Amino acid sequence: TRLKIVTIHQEPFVYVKPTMSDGTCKEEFTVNGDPVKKVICTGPNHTVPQCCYGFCIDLLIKLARTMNFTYEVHLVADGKFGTQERVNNSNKKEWNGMMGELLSGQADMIVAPLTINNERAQYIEFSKPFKYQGLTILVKKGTRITGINDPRLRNPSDKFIYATVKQSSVDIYFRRQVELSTMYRHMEKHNYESAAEAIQAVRDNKLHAFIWDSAVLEFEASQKCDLVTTGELFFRSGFGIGMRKDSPWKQNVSLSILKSHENGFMEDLDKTWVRYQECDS
């Protein structure tokens, strides 16, 4: 009966914290003074129960209420979003990350900042976008780069290292475009396992530029005054809920998302989780 929901750590959409010593989740309040809704999410720390909250968790709760379903949340085991790759040193291809879990049945729905792209749409179904965003670049304040067309990115050198997250939509964006071959070849040698690690690397001067989702990078840069983004987005894409094709939830999930875009719910999530205070971290 319970839907198996898979998600991934990705602030401000999904925060992941340890439970308190008694197994419960710390009582916290939003900027508006309301209780922060927290759900138990099992996953690698060893796999244990942890506390999850954020933009996507509030969205999941809204969907569950509106569509009248129960659920259990877990964090993707390999910590990745999902790309299709050859496995077991053979020519057989399988999806990794949340994509792989949804296709295998380990999950029934992906509720996370999951990018809608053509490659994934060939295998799964997406709801209409719950968030409209794109791609941008994160650098340390002081680093001078124009954007995706900067010579230090287009004419790669070991003097200026840039990368993205392994097995993600951004990795595929660069891998599937011949014009971006030189950039792809450079990043392939530097890609990180998670967005948090890449962001920390930029802060520590170990990575000079991190190419990633603007919804995430603009939030990170706006919370940390030592980090900035390169301005305008160089590509636009949306985040959607993922389900297996021919699922009984597709129509209703999109109806819920439509209602939330129409009545201010999505806008309120932005004021609660994305734009609400000056930098302090």
Side-chain angles (χ1 to χ4, degrees), residues 2-3 5-25 27-44 46-64 66-71 73-91 93-124 126-139 141-143 145-157 160-174 177 180-184 186-187 190-222 224-231 233-235 237-249 252-258 260-266 268-281:
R2 285 181 174 293
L3 273 65
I5 306 299
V6 65
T7 193
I8 188 171
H9 173 45
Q10 194 85 177
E11 292 167 31
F13 296 91
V14 183
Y15 287 80
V16 181
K17 303 287 181 178
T19 57
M20 292 180 273
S21 57
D22 64 9
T24 64
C25 295
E27 290 186 57
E28 295 185 82
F29 302 84
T30 68
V31 63
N32 298 306
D34 303 303
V36 169
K37 300 174 176 66
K38 294 186 179 185
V39 304
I40 296 300
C41 52
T42 59
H46 291 293
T47 292
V48 302
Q50 297 175 66
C51 297
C52 279
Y53 55 93
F55 185 116
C56 283
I57 299 305
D58 278 3
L59 182 58
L60 165 63
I61 290 169
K62 180 62 173 185
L63 289 172
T66 297
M67 293 173 58
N68 188 196
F69 67 74
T70 55
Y71 60 83
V73 182
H74 77 269
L75 293 167
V76 59
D78 70 1
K80 306 300 188 299
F81 284 88
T83 57
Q84 185 182 46
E85 304 181 305
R86 284 179 166 72
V87 299
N88 198 34
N89 286 119
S90 74
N91 286 133
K93 293 180 178 184
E94 303 190 323
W95 286 83
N96 51 226
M98 297 186 284
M99 282 291 295
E101 293 201 10
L102 175 63
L103 289 170
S104 75
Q106 297 171 74
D108 295 311
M109 186 180 286
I110 300 174
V111 179
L114 182 74
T115 293
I116 297 165
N117 63 25
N118 305 314
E119 15 286 283
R120 291 168 177 171
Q122 288 179 27
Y123 295 79
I124 67 160
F126 288 101
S127 66
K128 286 295 182 181
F130 65 79
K131 172 162 291 299
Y132 307 106
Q133 59 115 43
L135 300 180
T136 192
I137 308 177
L138 181 86
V139 299
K141 180 181 175 184
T143 293
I145 271 199
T146 63
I148 193 65
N149 290 160
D150 193 287
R152 280 195 288 184
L153 299 187
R154 297 291 180 160
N155 185 184
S157 167
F160 194 86
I161 305 177
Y162 59 89
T164 189
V165 182
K166 299 183 174 178
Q167 303 161 60
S168 69
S169 55
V170 186
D171 176 66
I172 301 180
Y173 178 83
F174 286 78
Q177 300 183 61
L180 301 175
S181 298
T182 301
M183 292 188 74
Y184 177 67
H186 172 274
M187 274 180 287
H190 302 290
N191 289 336
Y192 285 68
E193 301 301 323
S194 71
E197 295 173 79
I199 292 159
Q200 184 62 57
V202 173
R203 169 165 261 183
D204 302 329
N205 302 307
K206 296 183 178 181
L207 174 61
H208 302 298
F210 174 41
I211 303 176
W212 193 236
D213 292 321
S214 62
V216 171
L217 297 187
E218 291 181 356
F219 172 76
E220 287 283 354
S222 296
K224 298 167 178 173
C225 271
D226 60 311
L227 299 174
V228 303
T229 58
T230 57
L233 315 192
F234 66 83
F235 183 63
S237 59
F239 289 154
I241 300 299
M243 302 152 271
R244 280 185 293 279
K245 286 193 172 187
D246 296 299
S247 170
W249 306 300
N252 288 314
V253 169
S254 283
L255 283 174
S256 182
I257 287 169
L258 169 63
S260 291
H261 282 299
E262 297 181 337
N263 67 17
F265 184 72
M266 292 295 202
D268 290 316
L269 291 182
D270 287 325
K271 296 189 296 68
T272 297
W273 300 105
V274 186
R275 299 188 184 79
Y276 56 91
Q277 66 183 29
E278 300 303 332
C279 66
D280 76 324
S281 303

Short mmCIF file of all heavy atoms in Angstrom, two decimals, residues 144-169, unseen atoms left out:
data_model
loop_
_atom_site.label_atom_id
_atom_site.label_comp_id
_atom_site.label_asym_id
_atom_site.label_seq_id
_atom_site.Cartn_x
_atom_site.Cartn_y
_atom_site.Cartn_z
N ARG A 144 37.38 35.45 -11.51
CA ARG A 144 36.77 36.14 -12.65
C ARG A 144 36.50 35.27 -13.87
O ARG A 144 37.40 34.98 -14.66
CB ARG A 144 37.63 37.33 -13.05
N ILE A 145 35.24 34.87 -14.02
CA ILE A 145 34.79 34.07 -15.15
C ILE A 145 33.52 34.69 -15.70
O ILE A 145 32.63 35.09 -14.94
CB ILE A 145 34.52 32.60 -14.74
CG1 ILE A 145 35.80 31.78 -14.89
CG2 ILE A 145 33.39 32.01 -15.59
CD1 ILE A 145 35.56 30.28 -14.97
N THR A 146 33.42 34.76 -17.03
CA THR A 146 32.26 35.36 -17.69
C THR A 146 31.02 34.47 -17.71
O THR A 146 29.90 34.94 -17.54
CB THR A 146 32.58 35.72 -19.15
OG1 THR A 146 32.88 34.52 -19.88
CG2 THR A 146 33.78 36.65 -19.22
N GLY A 147 31.24 33.18 -17.92
CA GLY A 147 30.14 32.24 -17.99
C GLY A 147 30.63 30.98 -18.66
O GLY A 147 31.83 30.70 -18.67
N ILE A 148 29.70 30.23 -19.25
CA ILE A 148 30.05 28.97 -19.90
C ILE A 148 30.97 29.14 -21.12
O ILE A 148 31.57 28.17 -21.58
CB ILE A 148 28.76 28.21 -20.32
CG1 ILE A 148 29.10 26.77 -20.71
CG2 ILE A 148 28.08 28.93 -21.48
CD1 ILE A 148 29.62 25.95 -19.55
N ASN A 149 31.09 30.37 -21.62
CA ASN A 149 31.94 30.63 -22.78
C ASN A 149 33.31 31.19 -22.43
O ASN A 149 34.08 31.56 -23.32
CB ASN A 149 31.23 31.59 -23.74
CG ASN A 149 30.03 30.95 -24.43
OD1 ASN A 149 29.15 31.65 -24.93
ND2 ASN A 149 30.00 29.63 -24.46
N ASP A 150 33.63 31.25 -21.14
CA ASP A 150 34.91 31.79 -20.71
C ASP A 150 36.06 30.95 -21.25
O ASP A 150 36.00 29.72 -21.26
CB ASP A 150 34.97 31.83 -19.18
CG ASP A 150 36.13 32.65 -18.66
OD1 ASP A 150 37.29 32.19 -18.76
OD2 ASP A 150 35.90 33.78 -18.17
N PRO A 151 37.13 31.60 -21.74
CA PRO A 151 38.27 30.85 -22.28
C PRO A 151 38.89 29.84 -21.30
O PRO A 151 39.43 28.82 -21.73
CB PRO A 151 39.25 31.96 -22.67
CG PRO A 151 38.34 33.06 -23.09
CD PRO A 151 37.28 33.04 -22.00
N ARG A 152 38.82 30.11 -20.00
CA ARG A 152 39.39 29.18 -19.03
C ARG A 152 38.56 27.91 -18.91
O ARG A 152 38.99 26.93 -18.30
CB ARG A 152 39.57 29.86 -17.66
CG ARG A 152 40.83 30.72 -17.60
CD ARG A 152 41.23 31.10 -16.18
NE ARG A 152 40.34 32.08 -15.58
CZ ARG A 152 40.53 32.62 -14.38
NH1 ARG A 152 41.58 32.28 -13.65
NH2 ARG A 152 39.66 33.51 -13.90
N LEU A 153 37.37 27.92 -19.51
CA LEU A 153 36.52 26.74 -19.51
C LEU A 153 36.60 26.11 -20.91
O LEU A 153 36.70 24.89 -21.04
CB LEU A 153 35.06 27.11 -19.21
CG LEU A 153 34.73 27.76 -17.86
CD1 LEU A 153 33.21 27.88 -17.73
CD2 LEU A 153 35.29 26.94 -16.72
N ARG A 154 36.60 26.95 -21.94
CA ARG A 154 36.65 26.46 -23.32
C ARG A 154 38.03 25.99 -23.78
O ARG A 154 38.14 25.20 -24.72
CB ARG A 154 36.11 27.54 -24.26
CG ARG A 154 34.65 27.89 -24.01
CD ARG A 154 33.74 26.73 -24.41
NE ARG A 154 32.32 27.04 -24.20
CZ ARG A 154 31.32 26.40 -24.79
NH1 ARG A 154 31.57 25.41 -25.64
NH2 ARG A 154 30.07 26.75 -24.54
N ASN A 155 39.08 26.47 -23.12
CA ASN A 155 40.46 26.09 -23.43
C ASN A 155 41.02 25.58 -22.11
O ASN A 155 41.87 26.23 -21.49
CB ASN A 155 41.23 27.33 -23.92
CG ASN A 155 42.65 27.00 -24.38
OD1 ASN A 155 43.42 27.90 -24.73
ND2 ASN A 155 43.00 25.72 -24.39
N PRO A 156 40.54 24.40 -21.66
CA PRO A 156 40.93 23.73 -20.42
C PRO A 156 42.42 23.61 -20.13
O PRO A 156 43.22 23.29 -21.01
CB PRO A 156 40.26 22.37 -20.54
CG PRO A 156 39.04 22.67 -21.33
CD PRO A 156 39.58 23.57 -22.41
N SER A 157 42.77 23.85 -18.87
CA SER A 157 44.14 23.76 -18.40
C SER A 157 44.14 23.34 -16.94
O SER A 157 43.17 23.59 -16.22
CB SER A 157 44.83 25.12 -18.54
OG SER A 157 46.05 25.14 -17.81
N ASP A 158 45.22 22.71 -16.50
CA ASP A 158 45.34 22.26 -15.12
C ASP A 158 45.46 23.43 -14.15
O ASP A 158 45.51 23.24 -12.94
CB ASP A 158 46.54 21.34 -14.97
N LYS A 159 45.51 24.65 -14.69
CA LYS A 159 45.64 25.84 -13.87
C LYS A 159 44.28 26.28 -13.33
O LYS A 159 44.20 26.93 -12.29
CB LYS A 159 46.26 26.97 -14.68
N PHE A 160 43.22 25.92 -14.04
CA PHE A 160 41.86 26.27 -13.63
C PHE A 160 40.98 25.03 -13.74
O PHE A 160 40.51 24.67 -14.82
CB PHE A 160 41.31 27.38 -14.52
CG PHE A 160 40.07 28.04 -13.98
CD1 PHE A 160 40.17 29.10 -13.09
CD2 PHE A 160 38.82 27.58 -14.35
CE1 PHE A 160 39.02 29.70 -12.56
CE2 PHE A 160 37.66 28.16 -13.83
CZ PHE A 160 37.77 29.23 -12.93
N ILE A 161 40.73 24.39 -12.60
CA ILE A 161 39.93 23.17 -12.57
C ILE A 161 38.44 23.40 -12.36
O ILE A 161 38.03 24.16 -11.47
CB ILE A 161 40.42 22.24 -11.44
CG1 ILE A 161 41.92 21.95 -11.61
CG2 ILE A 161 39.62 20.94 -11.45
CD1 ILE A 161 42.51 21.10 -10.51
N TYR A 162 37.62 22.75 -13.18
CA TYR A 162 36.18 22.86 -13.05
C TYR A 162 35.57 21.48 -13.19
O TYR A 162 36.18 20.57 -13.77
CB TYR A 162 35.60 23.85 -14.07
CG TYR A 162 35.86 23.53 -15.53
CD1 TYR A 162 34.98 22.72 -16.25
CD2 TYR A 162 36.96 24.07 -16.19
CE1 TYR A 162 35.19 22.47 -17.60
CE2 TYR A 162 37.18 23.82 -17.54
CZ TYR A 162 36.29 23.02 -18.24
OH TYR A 162 36.51 22.78 -19.58
N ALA A 163 34.38 21.32 -12.63
CA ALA A 163 33.73 20.01 -12.65
C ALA A 163 32.26 20.11 -12.32
O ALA A 163 31.73 21.18 -12.03
CB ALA A 163 34.41 19.11 -11.64
N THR A 164 31.60 18.96 -12.37
CA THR A 164 30.20 18.85 -12.00
C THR A 164 30.07 17.61 -11.13
O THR A 164 31.08 17.11 -10.60
CB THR A 164 29.28 18.78 -13.24
OG1 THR A 164 27.91 18.89 -12.83
CG2 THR A 164 29.47 17.48 -14.02
N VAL A 165 28.85 17.13 -10.95
CA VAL A 165 28.60 15.93 -10.14
C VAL A 165 28.50 14.70 -11.05
O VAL A 165 27.84 14.73 -12.09
CB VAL A 165 27.29 16.06 -9.35
CG1 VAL A 165 27.07 14.81 -8.48
CG2 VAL A 165 27.32 17.31 -8.49
N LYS A 166 29.18 13.62 -10.65
CA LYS A 166 29.16 12.37 -11.41
C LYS A 166 27.74 11.79 -11.51
O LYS A 166 26.93 11.96 -10.60
CB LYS A 166 30.04 11.31 -10.73
CG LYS A 166 31.51 11.64 -10.59
CD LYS A 166 32.24 10.45 -9.97
CE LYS A 166 33.74 10.66 -9.92
NZ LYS A 166 34.43 9.51 -9.27
N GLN A 167 27.47 11.10 -12.61
CA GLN A 167 26.19 10.44 -12.82
C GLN A 167 24.97 11.32 -12.57
O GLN A 167 24.02 10.93 -11.90
CB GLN A 167 26.12 9.19 -11.94
CG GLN A 167 27.27 8.22 -12.21
CD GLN A 167 27.47 7.25 -11.06
OE1 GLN A 167 26.57 6.49 -10.71
NE2 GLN A 167 28.66 7.27 -10.47
N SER A 168 25.01 12.52 -13.15
CA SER A 168 23.94 13.49 -13.02
C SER A 168 23.51 13.99 -14.39
O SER A 168 24.15 13.71 -15.41
CB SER A 168 24.41 14.70 -12.21
OG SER A 168 25.37 15.45 -12.94
N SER A 169 22.42 14.75 -14.42
CA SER A 169 21.92 15.32 -15.66
C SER A 169 22.93 16.29 -16.27
O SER A 169 23.00 16.44 -17.49
CB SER A 169 20.61 16.06 -15.40
OG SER A 169 20.78 17.03 -14.38
#
